Each structure stands twice: as C-alpha cells, then as structure tokens.
Design a protein around this ligand. Structure first.
Ligand SMILES: OC[C@H]1O[C@H](O[C@H]2[C@H](O)[C@@H](O)[C@@H](O[C@H]3[C@H](O)[C@@H](O)[C@@H](O)O[C@@H]3CO)O[C@@H]2CO)[C@H](O)[C@@H](O)[C@@H]1O
Length: 476
C-alpha cells in the first residue's frame, strides 16, 4: 500500500514590458528566473523523485526575451552600471528596492545593514549595494558555484559584479532547456495556463461570482469576454507547442479558478486534466475526499489539491526550522497513509517561486531535506502528472457540478467587488468595446486586479502604469 504524492509548482509573472518603450519596468521576472525558475526543476538532477511544473505563456515570453539579451530592464541597468554613471533617479530606485526587500532572510548580509545605515554612499559603497542586491537572489546552483564571492559579503568590484551578472544570464539561457529535459526524461510533467493568467470563469460569465458571494457589487459587463477566454486557452496551447513540440494535455487554471462553464471550455479545448482547490470541492459536494481522482461529467479529470499541505509549504514552514518542518510534513503524510484502505493521491499545488525568499537560505536546507527524505520513504511514490492521470490502483468518482471559485477562500473577492478593483473592470469593459489587438488579453491578467485596492502592494504604481498602458495600446 502506497501513498501517491504529486508536487505541482506553478510559475508565473505578468508582463512587465511597457508596450510603448519596451522597457521592463520591474525586475521580478529577472530575479525569480535566476533564483527559482532554473533551480526548482534543477533539484531533479540531485534527487530521484518526480516534480511537476506549470509555466504560464507570458512568463515563457519574458524568459525568452531575457535569454536572448533583448529585455530592457530598468532596475537591472541601475545594477549593472558603474556607480559613477548612475543617475540620481537610479540611486533612489536601488535604495528603494533594497528597503522593500530588507527584512527578507535572503537579504541577511551584514553589509546591507551597514549601507542602509549611512547618510550617503560613495562609489565603493554603491558597488556593494548593487552587487548584494544581485547576490541576495542567488539560486541554489550558483550558491555553490559562487560560494567564495557570497561569503565575501562586502568590497565588491565592478569586475566581480559583471562576473555574477554573466553567470546569472547563463542560468536564464539554460532554463527552458532544463524543462524540456526533465519532461523528456520522465522526471516531471510540464503544464501551462491560459496565456496571460486571467480569471476564466469571470470572462465566461461574470455572474458566477454570485455562486459564493451574493452581496458583492460588480460593474455593468456590457461586453462579452467569452471569445477572449477561448483565445487565452488556444494561444497558450500554441505557445506550449512551440517550446515542447506537443500540445498540452494538462493545464493549471489560474488561481485554481473553475466553474461549470470553464471546465467545459478546457474540455472543448482538448485538456485532459487540471487541478483546483479543496475548498471548491467542499462547496460543490456534500461529502468528498480530496484523495480521489475526479471526473467532471466524464469529460475531464480533476484533482483537488490538499490545501493544508500546500499552505504549510507556501505560508507556514518558512517560520520553522528545516528538520522540524520536514518531520511535520512526513508525519502528516503518514497519517493520511494510515487513514484509508486504498492508495490516496495527495496533490501539493502552490506557487513555485514566491515562498522561498522567506525561508532561511532561500529554502534550500528545507527542500534538500524534504526531497532527500521523500526519496527514501518506501511507502511514498511521487508521481508525474501523467502518472497521476493514468494510475489504475486509485479510487475515482464522477462529479456533475462545481460551485465557481478560486483557491482564495473559494471566491473572487481578491479580484473584484471593491471600488478600486471594480474601477479596473469598468476600464477593461469600456476598452474592450474598442479593442483592436491582443493587448486587451494582456490587460485581462489576474495580477492587475489583485494589486488594486490593497494595503500592501509594493510598486502598485508600476502595475497601474502597465495595466493602463496595455489598455491604451489595445485600442490603437
Ligand atoms: O511588486 C509586487 C510583487 O510582484 C512580484 O510578485 C509576482 C509573483 O512573483 C508572481 O509569481 C505572480 O504572483 C501571482 C501568482 O502566480 C498567482 O498564482 C497568485 O498567487 O497571485 C500572484 C499575484 O497575482 O505575480 C506577482 C506580480 O503580480 C514579486 O515577485 C513580489 O515579490 C512583489 O511583492
């Protein structure tokens, strides 16, 4: 009797490329590429387990632009320059960026503490500020290769900074290749999402928000987004085809969002399996275990992720010591294993790049211990998405209807329903009336609405600038 374990790491960035200047207005794609997008599948070189990945098409587009040397990244330019060449505005961006990231464990360099304590920085001090911002995002592979420079922690030269930059771009250039390789070697499956990561159930039918939040106020959806919902899925299939040579059969629905209409669309588009969230399952059927493979109307296969295990990694374990965290997680798996006669399928699905910066040492002690432990547990079998989809010795059940929702509380309130988020939908609705090109699809991405009308929102003015630029470009 085995427990089947399925990791599915979701990787995504909205488009930071301003359409009129071509400049990347935030560096987050660059920094998550050098820290997470190569290194997460690269664990499979060292550990004999299966790990699965979702890559959104808009993320793939940007990785390609960086790897080709075409990304005009404004924050990265302030890092690369000799400090004597920095504009006053660029120094201010560097300090601002440091300040935002300052409390993250990956920024735990004594020299950063000293630099942010100085009234003004000379050329040598700015060289350190630039280089330590780069090194803070060093991924697992180069933390071993560049170990000597990392332990330096201060006194960086322009030549050392440029050397680190060159190694980082090497990592980016190898990123799509590592995904093809782990896919071809059978170490993992690779999925994609509708192209710009939109909320497909809202595009198909805005009134689906009233399935879970009857009191929410939404704007007048005076235009149809149904054809755009189809286009997101179709263009995603073409982009995945271009990278991997075949059409995708697995998709990750953005925000785990599903509805009856969305499931039908994925089915009509040839998708064979997706996953969603445990809260959706609980809202949709009275009694339902998440350890079964489900069949929606006998049209498409659905797994419901284990929300507890997924949230422990994604939100809890950064606050734990690495060994205790792994012991806790293995112990929960043991309880699941002992709780049923059949062989359960346990889906662990979460963002693949966002939690690690809050762990000690970028989550590397945690993940190395977790994977090293999992690979020697004889009663656990990690599975690719393809293996999970075809596994015969598993329990299954047919479901006829789901209640629309997302993995955030089972509902859509993080993207619609307050004044500021509703203003964005009205802008999109009015723009959709006059849209002339596919930049209207870019503005349909979920990220723009997520940051609107929120308290934190680092660089929300940049996201607002991007959203409104795409909305303006779509009408020309
Ligand atoms: O400056 C704000 C914020 O920007 C960057 O966050 C990006 C994430 O790194 C990226 O993964 C993506 O996050 C979305 C997930 O893919 C998605 O599944 C869901 O959880 O919502 C997220 C937001 O829409 O996009 C965001 C930007 O939208 C940067 O990395 C953060 O550090 C920074 O705080």
């Amino acid at each position: 009797k085995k427990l089947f374990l399925v990791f599915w790491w979701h990787m995504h960035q909205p488009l930071y490329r301003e359409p009129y200047t071509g400049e990347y207005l935030l560096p987050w794609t660059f920094f998550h590429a050098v820290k997470d997008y190569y290194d997460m599948p690269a664990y499979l070189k060292d550990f004999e387990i299966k790990l699965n990945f979702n890559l959104t098409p808009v993320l793939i587009d940007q990785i390609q632009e960086y790897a080709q040397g075409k990304a005009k990244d404004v924050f990265l330019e302030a890092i690369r320059k000799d400090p004597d060449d920095l504009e006053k505005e660029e120094v201010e961006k560097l300090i601002e960026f440091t300040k935002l990231n300052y409390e993250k464990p990956i920024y735990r360099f004594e020299r950063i503490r000293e630099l942010m304590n100085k009234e003004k920085l000379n050329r040598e001090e700015l060289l350190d500020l630039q280089t330590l911002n780069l090194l803070a995002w060093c991924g697992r592979t180069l933390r071993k290769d560049l170990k000597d420079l990392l332990n330096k922690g201060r006194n960086y030269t322009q030549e050392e900074k440029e050397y680190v930059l060159n190694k980082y771009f090497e990592i980016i250039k190898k990123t799509l290749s590592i995904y093809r390789e782990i896919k071809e070697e059978g170490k993992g499956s690779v999925s994609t999402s509708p192209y710009y990561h939109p909320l497909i159930p809202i595009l198909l039918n805005p009134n689906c928000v009233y399935e879970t939040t009857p009191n929410v106020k939404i704007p007048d959806f005076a235009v149809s987004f149904r054809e755009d919902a189809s286009k997101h899925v179709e263009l995603a299939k073409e982009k995945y085809f271009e990278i991997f040579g075949e059409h995708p059969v697995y998709m990750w629905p953005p925000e785990a969002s599903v509805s009856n209409e969305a499931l039908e669309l994925y089915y009509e588009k040839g998708i064979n399996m997706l996953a969603t969230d445990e809260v959706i399952l609980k809202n949709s059927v009275e009694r339902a275990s998440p350890y079964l493979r489900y069949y929606f109307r006998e049209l498409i296969s659905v797994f419901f992720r284990d929300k507890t295990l997924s949230d422990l990694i994604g939100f809890s374990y950064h606050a734990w010591n690495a060994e205790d965290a792994v012991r806790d997680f293995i112990g929960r798996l043991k309880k699941i294993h002992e709780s049923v006669d059949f062989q359960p399928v346990v889906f662990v699905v979460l963002d693949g790049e966002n939690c690690w910066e809050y762990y000690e040492e970028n989550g590397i002690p945690f993940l190395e211990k977790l994977y090293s432990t999992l690979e020697k547990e004889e009663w656990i079998e990690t599975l690719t998405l393809e293996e999970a989809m075809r596994k015969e010795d598993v329990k299954t059940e047919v479901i006829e209807s789901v209640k629309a929702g997302t993995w955030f509380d089972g509902n859509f309130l993080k993207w619609i329903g307050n004044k500021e988020k509703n203003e964005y939908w009205k802008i999109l609705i009015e723009a959709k009336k006059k849209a002339k090109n596919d930049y209207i699809l870019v503005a349909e991405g979920s990220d723009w609405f997520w940051w609107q009308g929120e308290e934190k929102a680092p660089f929300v003015e940049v996201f607002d600038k991007l959203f409104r630029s795409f909305v303006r470009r779509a009408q020309e």
